[PDB]
Ligand SMILES: N[C@H]1C(C(=O)O)=CC=C[C@@H]1O
């Protein structure tokens with residue numbers, strides 16, 4: 001049904017989708033300004049780490065400082081195979097993608113890093129309020145030359 | 159109010175019900191969870207230590223896998239379940255927690271908890287592809303397996 005309230009929802013979803021697309025295509029020196037897509041109190045970061053706790057980055061200014069580090073440590077990073085998922089909530093989207101690039105972490109040799117990612121994007125007033133990234137930390141261990149722990153799964157059917 | 163979109167709303171509603179049933183399946187009912195799949199449907203773990211999926215292919219193999227899983231995770235429950243519909247009536251995502259004892263051959267009994275994302279794709283009102291994404295490090299911890307620590311020098315705070 002075509003009501004002003006359904007129209008408002010569609011418009012919000014369309015606006016927010018464009019912001020998700022811009023985020024996922026932001027590369028190179030543009031990464032230094034990605035934070036501008038966030039609310040002033042917006043949070044971003046990595047939810048899947050070896051410690052089990054997230055690396056949450058709180059606030060638009062912190063996000064921008066993080067991006068200086070990110071560009072140093074992942075200097076040519078690109079997201080590919082981007083699939084955007086709208087949800088029943090006009091302010092909530094999911095993205096499934098791949099990413100690849102050099103990894104340059106101090107204390108490890110330079111490597112090439114590939115991973116599979118899910119990202120969650122929640123909006124408020126057309127800006128991102130919360131972004132979360134989910135990946136397999138084991139693939140990051142491999143890129144850094146760190147031995148990956150192995151689980152045996154005896155009797156697992158074949 | 160068109161018959162195509164009416165088809166779609168119906169398909170998405172039916173499919174949502176199957177995603178709910180899946181996520182609420184516990185205990186011995188786990189042995190029959192594979193009946194929610196197409197005959198050729200695929201399920202499994204997409205975040206493994208090998209970096210390749212452990213994909214289980216076919217309704218019969220899925221039911222076999224469930225015997226094993228019931229042994230290794232005897233009291234498993236999903237909680238905090240959030241279901242996401244998408245623009246595709248045949249594609250859903252779920253974010254949830256899961257916890258239970260972990261009883262694997264050759265590791266001490268543990269208590270396992272993790273955060274999950276599940277992907278559910280449908281065909282003909284049944285699951286064609288289920289994929290689970292989690293943090294393998296939390297499973298290593300549960301089993302007493304040492305987890306290395308990535309150093310991020312210079313990471314701002
Ligand atoms: N946070 C991502 C980063 C980024 O641009 O956000 C670059 C490379 C890898 C990290 O997963």
Ligand SMILES: N[C@H]1C(C(=O)O)=CC=C[C@@H]1O
Nearest residue numbers: 188203227231234256290
């Ligand atoms: N595949 C899950 C299994 C299940 O019910 O599918 C139980 C416990 C842990 C595994 O993530």
